[model samples]
Target: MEAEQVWKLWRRVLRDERLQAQLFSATDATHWLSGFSESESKILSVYAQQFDRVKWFVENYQFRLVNSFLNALETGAPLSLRALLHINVDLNAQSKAFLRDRQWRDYGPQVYTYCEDVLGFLAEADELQGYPEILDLMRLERESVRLYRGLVDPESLPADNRYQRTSMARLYETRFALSGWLRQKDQLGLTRLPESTEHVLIYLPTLQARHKFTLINAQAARLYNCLEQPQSAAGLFMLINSDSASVPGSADLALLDRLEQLNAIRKPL
Candidate 1:
């Protein structure tokens, strides 16, 4: 209603300009002018002039919030990924603060969707909007481009660091047969694509894969959960190479190479 109220005042503020001029300066004014006495005309003129300033501030408020928030993020993302994700909560709360416009306000328009999300990306995302979900995918593309650009030099970090999941990583569950559609997109034309459960692990790009992301099974997704934090190569291998039936053998050990090649896991310095 804040936006609506400001607009209403702005409309009347401009519309009544000519009438207000006639209110005081001339006796032969519009017929509605006679309905007000001297005291009424004085106060109405006062209110009319003040609302324009009110409109100024409502606009200034929006610009201030957005500008300061973006400027803060220009420096760096926070250390905790959870802290980065918590931004959605505070913004959505602001959306709720404006949600008191229940029944027909008679003077107010109805809202179909009340939504807000993400100052880091500078976009409004609501329920079912893919923007929020695509953050990881977008980050993957950025890292892939960085790797491509930085290819001129090799990064030499200390081997003492443990392998950890990159911030560019994300998991997905989809019903579409995304692999076939991508593999034969030219032949089948996406419309004839199949539907089936497929789990995927999207991460930074690598020379091994044609794209920035990879299609993985449920097991790989489970393994991804384990590497949420830094994990030693020896400790990781011992857990995965356990006697458990689900654990993989020597041949499957090659998957670890793909993780490093994709830059999905990095040895932090």
Candidate 2:
């Protein structure tokens, strides 16, 4: 047979779970390869003997691809293949651990879905507590994934002038000063943890794959709350009107535009 034909036959054997398993047993392997030509039989004999090692290499390659992809999404930085080699762990052991933790399944086949699901699981489990920056980073990344998927529609704004928190935005108040260290986590393990008692707002500016954030002061926080529900802008101004001196000129229009960009504020239907 031609090289392509041989390759196809090999792949067919690999794809069939029953045949693949049979390769582990000498009796099964001999019976399964009985129909092949001498040359094909020789190839099958070698492959069956080294099947476990071959499978390990394939699984590791796939896991590395997924690991690098996820790291890129979270950090906006790529992890080189050489770098991936350093973090290697046994696949069977890792699989068993994830199963024990009930986290063995990917959320779905979609990249965003899988990333979001993994982050969600990590967040709920508080797995990144020791690396709070990772937690905060993932929180922002998750919101970005939602925006990229268009989970919230700015165009589907309610008809009412009332506003509500943007579906694509998240507010975080972290005790750990992690933002600065998040990008560098892969290169330099954190030497010292600093204190940062600050509130942050992370949101998607557009239906893009990336996200943006801003540090919030008390006033900004208050304004965010003012529009948390289906409350009219006029009502908002009325409520906070007493503090008019603190408000900027054309602040309402600016706020409206800002929230719209963040997909954080929308008029009720």
Candidate 3:
């Protein structure tokens, strides 16, 4: 099946309002998997067990001929990529509020995992096989994985539990035009500061590695260059915590503790 064939089929299937309702209804069950906590572990376990079925939904039910090729051409997008977008929109509006709602949970790691599962299905979607159009889905999926990981990590988490973590670091980087926290200090044309109560700065392990801080001032400008790039405890954890092959320095650890004592951040868990 070509991408266009998928779209043509989708147009026909969606013409039936009942089918549309069924697909959309399926997404709510999907969304609920990431909405609960350990107290709700029983429910989470049920959903986790059903992950294969959920992946199947992305593969069989979601990626049929209806969403493959034709609908993508209608929108001038790649077949599999547009198809995934359609599913995203169908599952929910894919609005900022929905994303915000998810970020507030301690289950931030699961949010990215869910997105990866969905994207993985798209990457292997048969309708898109041998189609050059598959590249767009690949790009979309990779970007989603990156952004989802960046947002769900603790660095960008809201100080409150009611709000999910967001791409505050991204927003700060993009919006404020700050210097790359892990890269050059002056090239991005961003400002630097020692502390900010109004806005917090969060760094992930990747960022920490890029800048390599031993003293507070060692590449210190890179860390605090953006007043807007705030992260939470998880964000800090994600940035500093390395794989089995890596470890951060004690001076960096001591600096973080001092910052925490300064009341700039709180480790909720």
Candidate 4:
């Protein structure tokens, strides 16, 4: 009888923050169970066992989905899974219901789809939504993958000694400092650091590799911004003039030829 009462209280706390707070405020059975003598121990044991049962339900039934959810939040990169025994104590019944009886076998793919969708939505979400940094990271990484896939084989192009930029190249600006850390390191770390800005540019400049990304200078970055779409030789010259008067002539032309060699200049289809 006491066990059933404890279950009722537990469910209430799970579903409502107000009730959860009430329980923690020392008025509920959980508070009462903390003290007293032998009789209270028996009730505590029953509550403890039910808590374990709730854990078992998640682990045995919805293991993969929960694993995916945690992984998606933990790592913003490609989909992956890591299992833990702790079911969030704060999870409400509705949340548990959503997880239970899911398609466990397709967990990985489902997670990928979910993250992609979320990142897609977040990309256009308001900057004041307070997640711009997260959106930028996801956008950069996802596009990095796509950019790599769409790159032209550098080896197929004629060898050119002149430096060039490719029309296939792309660039993005991010204020998140971790963008550099993610690019340089294999594993992600949780340590916090002072935030800084970075400019990332991906281009197919080599004949041996598919694509490579690098931090570019302000002048080149300005040029990249102007080439919103494919431009002609004349257009490139004009665009450079309007973009910056001090646009280094010899240097800019050399860079333009390099971009041209990489076929970064897109011929309209």
Instruction: Please tell me which predicted candidate would have the highest TM-score against the true structure.
Output: 2
lDDT of 4 by residue, 230-249 (tens): 34344555666564445356
Per-candidate RMSD vs. true structure?
A: 14.2, 8.1, 19.1, 13.6
| Candidate 1 pairs with clashing backbones | none
lDDT tens digits, residue span 1-269, model 1: 25565456444433344444453354333333645546454544554545556456443544454343332332221211222343343533433222212111111111111111122232333521443323332232333334433444545544466767654445556555555534543432213435565666655464444334467756565556567655656565455535444545654556656656656666545
> Which ten contiguous residues of candidate 1 have the minimum total lDDT?
107-116
Q: What is the TM-score of each candidate against the true structure?
A: 0.37, 0.53, 0.22, 0.44
Better of 1 and 4 by lDDT: 4
Number of the top lDDT candidate: 2
lDDT of 3 by residue, 70-141 (tens): 232222222334444433333223222222233311222254454454444444545435432233334333
For residue 176, what is the lDDT in candidate 3?
A: 23
Taking the tens digit of each residue's C-alpha lDDT, what string does model 2 give over 1-269? 47886787665554444555555554446666576668777777666665677667544544654454454344431222122233342323433343335323333346666555555655654334555544555565565566556563444554565666656776666565544544454542234446775556667666555666666655556667776565655676665646763434465566556656666666554
Instruction: Order the candidates by TM-score, highest first.
Output: 2, 4, 1, 3
Instruction: Give the C-alpha miss distance for residue 182 in model 2, angstroms.
Output: 7.5
- Sort by lDDT, best first: what order? 2, 4, 1, 3
Output the lDDT of residue 60, model 2: 59
Model 1 spans > 4 angstroms off: 1-161, 180-195, 206-211, 217-219, 240-250, 267-269
Q: Report lDDT per candidate.
A: 0.43, 0.54, 0.36, 0.48
TM-score head-to-head 1 vs 2, winner: 2
The model with the greater lDDT, 1 or 2, is 2
